[PDB]
Amino acid sequence: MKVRASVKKLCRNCKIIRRDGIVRVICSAEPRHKQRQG
Amino acid sequence: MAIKLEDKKAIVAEVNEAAKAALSAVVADARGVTVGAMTGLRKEAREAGVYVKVVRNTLLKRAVEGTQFDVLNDVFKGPTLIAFSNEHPGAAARIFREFAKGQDKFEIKAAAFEGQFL
Amino acid sequence: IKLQVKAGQANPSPPVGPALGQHGVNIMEFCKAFNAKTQGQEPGLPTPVIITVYSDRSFTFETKSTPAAVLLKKAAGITSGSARPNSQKVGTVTRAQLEEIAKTKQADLTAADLDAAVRTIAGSARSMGLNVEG
Amino acid sequence: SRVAKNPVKLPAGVEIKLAGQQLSIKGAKGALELKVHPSVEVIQDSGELRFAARNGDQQTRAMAGTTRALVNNMVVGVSQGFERKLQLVGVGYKAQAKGQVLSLSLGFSHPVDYELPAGIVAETPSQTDILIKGIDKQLVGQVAAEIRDFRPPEPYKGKGVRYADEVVRRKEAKK
Amino acid sequence: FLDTPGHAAFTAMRARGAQATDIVILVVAADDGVMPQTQEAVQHAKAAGVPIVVAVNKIDKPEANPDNIKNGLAALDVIPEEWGGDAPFVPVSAKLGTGVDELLEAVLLQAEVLELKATPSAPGRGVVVESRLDKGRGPVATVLVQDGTLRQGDMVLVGINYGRVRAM
Amino acid sequence: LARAHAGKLENIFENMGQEEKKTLNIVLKADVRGSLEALQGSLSGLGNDEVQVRVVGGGVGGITESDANLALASNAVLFGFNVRADAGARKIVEAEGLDMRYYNVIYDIIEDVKKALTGMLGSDLRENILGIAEVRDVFRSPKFGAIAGCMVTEGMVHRNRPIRVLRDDVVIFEGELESLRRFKDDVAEVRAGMECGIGVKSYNDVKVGDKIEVFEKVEVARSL
Amino acid sequence: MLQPKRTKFRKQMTGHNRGLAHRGSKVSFGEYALKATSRGRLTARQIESARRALTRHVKRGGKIWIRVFPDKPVTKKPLEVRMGKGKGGVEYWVAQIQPGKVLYEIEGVSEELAREAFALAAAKLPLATSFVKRTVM
RNA sequence: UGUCGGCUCAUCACAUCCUGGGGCUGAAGCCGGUCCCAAGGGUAUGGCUGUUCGCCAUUUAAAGUGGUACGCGAGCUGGG
RNA sequence: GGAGGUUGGCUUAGAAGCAGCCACCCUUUAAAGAAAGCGUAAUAGCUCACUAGUCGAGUCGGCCUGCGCGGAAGAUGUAAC
Numbered sequence A: 001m002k003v004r005a006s007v008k009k010l011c012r013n014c015k016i017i018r019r020d021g022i023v024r025v026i027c028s029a030e031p032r033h034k035q036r037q038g
Numbered sequence B: 001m002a003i004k005l006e007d008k009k010a011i012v013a014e015v016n017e018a019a020k021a022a023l024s025a026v027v028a029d030a031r032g033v034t035v036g037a038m039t040g041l042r043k044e045a046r047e048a049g050v051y052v053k054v055v056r057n058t059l060l061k062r063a064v065e066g067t068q069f070d071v072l073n074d075v076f077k078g079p080t081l082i083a084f085s086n087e088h089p090g091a092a093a094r095i096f097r098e099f100a101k102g103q104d105k106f107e108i109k110a111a112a113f114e115g116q117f118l
Numbered sequence C: 001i002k003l004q005v006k007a008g009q010a011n012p013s014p015p016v017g018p019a020l021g022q023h024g025v026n027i028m029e030f031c032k033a034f035n036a037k038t039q040g041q042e043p044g045l046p047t048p049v050i051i052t053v054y055s056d057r058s059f060t061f062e063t064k065s066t067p068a069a070v071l072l073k074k075a076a077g078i079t080s081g082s083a084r085p086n087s088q089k090v091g092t093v094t095r096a097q098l099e100e101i102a103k104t105k106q107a108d109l110t111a112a113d114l115d116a117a118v119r120t121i122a123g124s125a126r127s128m129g130l131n132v133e134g
Numbered sequence D: 001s002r003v004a005k006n007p008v009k010l011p012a013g014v015e016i017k018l019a020g021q022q023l024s025i026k027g028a029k030g031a032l033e034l035k036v037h038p039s040v041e042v043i044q045d046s047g048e049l050r051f052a053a054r055n056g057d058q059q060t061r062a063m064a065g066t067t068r069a070l071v072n073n074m075v076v077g078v079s080q081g082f083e084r085k086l087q088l089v090g091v092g093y094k095a096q097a098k099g100q101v102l103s104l105s106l107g108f109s110h111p112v113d114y115e116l117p118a119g120i121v122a123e124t125p126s127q128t129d130i131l132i133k134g135i136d137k138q139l140v141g142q143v144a145a146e147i148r149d150f151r152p153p154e155p156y157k158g159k160g161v162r163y164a165d166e167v168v169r170r171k172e173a174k175k
Numbered sequence E: 001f002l003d004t005p006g007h008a009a010f011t012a013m014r015a016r017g018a019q020a021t022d023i024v025i026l027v028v029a030a031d032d033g034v035m036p037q038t039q040e041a042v043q044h045a046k047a048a049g050v051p052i053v054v055a056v057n058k059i060d061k062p063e064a065n066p067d068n069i070k071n072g073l074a075a076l077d078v079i080p081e082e083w084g085g086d087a088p089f090v091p092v093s094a095k096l097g098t099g100v101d102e103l104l105e106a107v108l109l110q111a112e113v114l115e116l117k118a119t120p121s122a123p124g125r126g127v128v129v130e131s132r133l134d135k136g137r138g139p140v141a142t143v144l145v146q147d148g149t150l151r152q153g154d155m156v157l158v159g160i161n162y163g164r165v166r167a168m
Numbered sequence F: 001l002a003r004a005h006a007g008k009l010e011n012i013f014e015n016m017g018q019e020e021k022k023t024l025n026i027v028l029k030a031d032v033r034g035s036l037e038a039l040q041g042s043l044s045g046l047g048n049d050e051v052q053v054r055v056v057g058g059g060v061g062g063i064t065e066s067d068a069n070l071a072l073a074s075n076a077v078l079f080g081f082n083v084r085a086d087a088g089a090r091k092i093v094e095a096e097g098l099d100m101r102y103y104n105v106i107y108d109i110i111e112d113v114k115k116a117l118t119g120m121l122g123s124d125l126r127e128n129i130l131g132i133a134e135v136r137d138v139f140r141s142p143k144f145g146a147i148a149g150c151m152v153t154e155g156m157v158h159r160n161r162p163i164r165v166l167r168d169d170v171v172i173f174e175g176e177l178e179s180l181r182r183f184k185d186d187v188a189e190v191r192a193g194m195e196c197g198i199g200v201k202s203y204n205d206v207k208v209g210d211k212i213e214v215f216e217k218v219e220v221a222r223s224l
Numbered sequence G: 001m002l003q004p005k006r007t008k009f010r011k012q013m014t015g016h017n018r019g020l021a022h023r024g025s026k027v028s029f030g031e032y033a034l035k036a037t038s039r040g041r042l043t044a045r046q047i048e049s050a051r052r053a054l055t056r057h058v059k060r061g062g063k064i065w066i067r068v069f070p071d072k073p074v075t076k077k078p079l080e081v082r083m084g085k086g087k088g089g090v091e092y093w094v095a096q097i098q099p100g101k102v103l104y105e106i107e108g109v110s111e112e113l114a115r116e117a118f119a120l121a122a123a124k125l126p127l128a129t130s131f132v133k134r135t136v137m
Numbered sequence H: 001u002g003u004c005g006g007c008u009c010a011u012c013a014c015a016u017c018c019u020g021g022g023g024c025u026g027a028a029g030c031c032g033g034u035c036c037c038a039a040g041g042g043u044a045u046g047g048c049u050g051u052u053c054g055c056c057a058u059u060u061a062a063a064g065u066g067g068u069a070c071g072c073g074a075g076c077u078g079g080g
Numbered sequence I: 001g002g003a004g005g006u007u008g009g010c011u012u013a014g015a016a017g018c019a020g021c022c023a024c025c026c027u028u029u030a031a032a033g034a035a036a037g038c039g040u041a042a043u044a045g046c047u048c049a050c051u052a053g054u055c056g057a058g059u060c061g062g063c064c065u066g067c068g069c070g071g072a073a074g075a076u077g078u079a080a081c
């Protein structure tokens, strides 16, 4: 999990989801692409 | 991919030039045995070589617009196995019958020996 | 099974081993293939072999065309290919040499005419580090 | 609203009850599934089943397609069944179902005994395969997730309990 | 019986065990399969030109499965007594003592070499297994007699050291 | 003798080709010849491209006076595998500061030799910056020839740190700070935005506009 | 960095920054430009930082113009100094920016390459910017 | 409106030193690095120096960072 | 459906698309990569890419703008209507 003020897609398989009021990035391929906040 | 700029136009033009071949044409639907059996039917290219080809059903109606094999418009639904012969009318219907005898695929849609609605 | 026998394995079974990875069957019964087949091109050609377990142990040998790796190595120079292909030539090849084995390898190759058939081996010899010229 | 518009297409043997906002489905080989509807869906009944919205709100459009999918799961769940395949990977890992107790050996000092809830039943065809048979998806999926959470898969060798329709990442120690 | 260490720092020692054995017992654990050191051991045995008899050990463990070992050893050209038949396999349990008698039967069945020692009345001839220095009795040499008979009070020439045996 | 001479020839040729190597000399005693040869063979692949381990004296039996003062004459480490030292060797070891370790497993010896090898390399002398000053106006002092009246532009300046003077991006002097002053105070540190007086005895060549750079060197060392 | 070769006077009054940029608001040389949409001032270290971040991204052809020049000297009073005792010494040079001023120009590249490269430059500047195209009027 | 340091006695914050729960790792294991949650309880003895600090010696799971008139002289001391 | 030369060459006990390096062509096709992933001790075997069929009406993205969301950690007690 990476926590930053500026989260964004890092490849083609990343998804931008809003979960309970927080913007997150979840990747189905690379676990280092997980992000929180922003 | 398969764009409408030239993939639809080129295949239509080639098929139209191929519609002036021998009247007899064979149509089937191969959703069965692997491409090896399809390549086995392609071995006729060395011996018979009629058309050994399958094209999109949507473009099939657009092609054959010369009123030479118009009967195939109402029979080309779903998959198609257009196998129009070049000489010695027949052959394709007889060869595929032997091919279907030793397999389980191939449905055989119709024939085109002169004007004949299947 | 698609094991590649090497000019005979009736007595020896170092690389035959028809029991590991497949249902172990009679080795003495199966090893007599080197007698009936008797290779065909010197006692050096490694040929492909396909066998079926069938119901319980019924053996059946098919034998395919010789691999196009010994023909490109044991007929035109050193029997070992170059480590780096397309960067350091291993050995020159003429068009007739490829056509010499093209007719022998009449199995498959999906070639309608001999004009296309040669182009299949040309890409094979290039991957071996050899040099091919018309 | 593609999902909502699509009728359910229930099979031959299924009994339908509709007490307004209360629905219940009776089926052979497992039955007694019921649920309540939120106040913003109309379920017209015929030889088929179709779903419509009452308002034109955003949430009503979203929930109209959720109610359709929930009912479709109920209809399939009574006629057909729901099962979720699990498999164990490793040495010494084994499972065994003894009635309503499923005993697993997953590399701990003690063996774990998991109590299968009422409704679903598990059965072990072999020592490394688990089936979770049930008639509703939520209870079948939830139990399969609880069991999998005892020893979830590892990247370095792949050991642990995993879904049979799951892709497991692998890595190797450097050098 | 000769017992050799299994680590990789003693390979030379293992070589010295191969040139005196006349038979190699290769012990491989059923659970662990074939490992680098058993491959090195079969290389040593082949270099010595000596028959090999294995003992797939630790069979009492529930894992067991003494079958992948057969394929792994066949890959290194050690054929089981089954299949074709070159060397005999046998499952043993070491610390339960199951199959040990059958292993002994297999190893003593190797009388096909006939193990002729020539006369025991020849002058003694042997090889040094190890050597050490004792603060109370000088250099002590553990030697394996190969043929002949060694008697107390005899002139011995070993390596570059010579002398006669005060004690044995 | 022939093998020793040939090995010396080859080693001298290789060393003169490369440069020099730091040796760790050990005197090794063991209980059996097999253990001794195993230890000698296994303690040969432990070196590096800049450090190496040498066995200067082997043997079988207890540790004696001869090998004790053989280690004394080579700065060697005295290892005894499954053996003990006698009374005289103990006297010698107590008299000086020779380090003698006993062992019963070869891997303990390997671990200790690796740990000793890892303690003979101390590079990574790269610099990290602390502050920069810029000279404007020049003064003179009786003890320090040219005093640079300067202003610190970034970071910090400390009284005794290695310096680097550069004008037009080319270094001219690389000494250290000797005298740091605020008016007549002799301060030890000046932070950015403050004006100060810099004095170095050997700089002696000051001109307005020259940049003065202050850094430190931190040793993160290496590994094998 | 960028600063006048010589000046009539060493110092200046702070002044004020008001109005819009009616002059210097057109793409006069290139095809694409970076234009300021808020008012502030660039310190000649942000101009050089944004230039190197801009020319590096192109690295193959293209002509680049700079329409801003820092010609205003600013002073700064050193630490631990009281108020008064004269004006401070000049430390750096700055340029006044009003909304609508063109900052950089480029030609000889695609619209997408210029649009990517001006994004990198705008991240080094303390003011809002925008991307514009050349028009006849 | 008595200004450093020490003693005695404390109270709060969390930007967490230990213990507790997790994500990623260039995470094999044993150890680590980094980030997120968490303030319940804990969180050295000495040699030098007036010292706070610092450097050393030897421990500990750890020897946290700060606010409180740089907490506390109508509570003590008086080395600076 | 997802193929033939072909276990491409080297290395390796054995590297067969999938330990590691180099190369990455041709063939019948509608389509198939000297292969993106799982698995095998190495095979074998389930995927993906790509193409044909069904489906049956929308889909993709940018610009301007009103109100909102994160970025947002402190010391006696809520304590920034």
Ligand SMILES: *C(=O)[C@H](CCSC)NC=O
Residues within 6 Å of the ligand: F136, F137, F149, F150, F151, F181, F182, F183, F195, F196, F197
């Ligand atoms: C010395 O007086 C120094 C000079 C600053 S630059 C003329 N100022 C303060 O120490």
Ligand SMILES: [Mg+2]
Residues within 6 Å of the ligand: A020
């Ligand atoms: Mg929650």
Ligand SMILES: [Mg+2]
Residues within 6 Å of the ligand: E032
């Ligand atoms: Mg082990």
Ligand SMILES: [Mg+2]
Residues within 6 Å of the ligand: G013, G014, G015
């Ligand atoms: Mg003013």
Ligand SMILES: [Mg+2]
Residues within 6 Å of the ligand: G023
């Ligand atoms: Mg003006």
Ligand SMILES: [Mg+2]
Residues within 6 Å of the ligand: H001
């Ligand atoms: Mg008072």
Ligand SMILES: [Mg+2]
Residues within 6 Å of the ligand: H008
């Ligand atoms: Mg106290």
Ligand SMILES: [Mg+2]
Residues within 6 Å of the ligand: H012, I076
């Ligand atoms: Mg408080």
Ligand SMILES: [Mg+2]
Residues within 6 Å of the ligand: none
């Ligand atoms: Mg916190």
Ligand SMILES: [Mg+2]
Residues within 6 Å of the ligand: none
């Ligand atoms: Mg931090």
Ligand SMILES: [Mg+2]
Residues within 6 Å of the ligand: H016, H017
């Ligand atoms: Mg902490």
Ligand SMILES: [Mg+2]
Residues within 6 Å of the ligand: none
């Ligand atoms: Mg913690």
Ligand SMILES: [Mg+2]
Residues within 6 Å of the ligand: none
């Ligand atoms: Mg962690």
Ligand SMILES: [Mg+2]
Residues within 6 Å of the ligand: H039
């Ligand atoms: Mg706490």
Ligand SMILES: [Mg+2]
Residues within 6 Å of the ligand: H039
């Ligand atoms: Mg606390």
Ligand SMILES: [Mg+2]
Residues within 6 Å of the ligand: H039
């Ligand atoms: Mg508290």
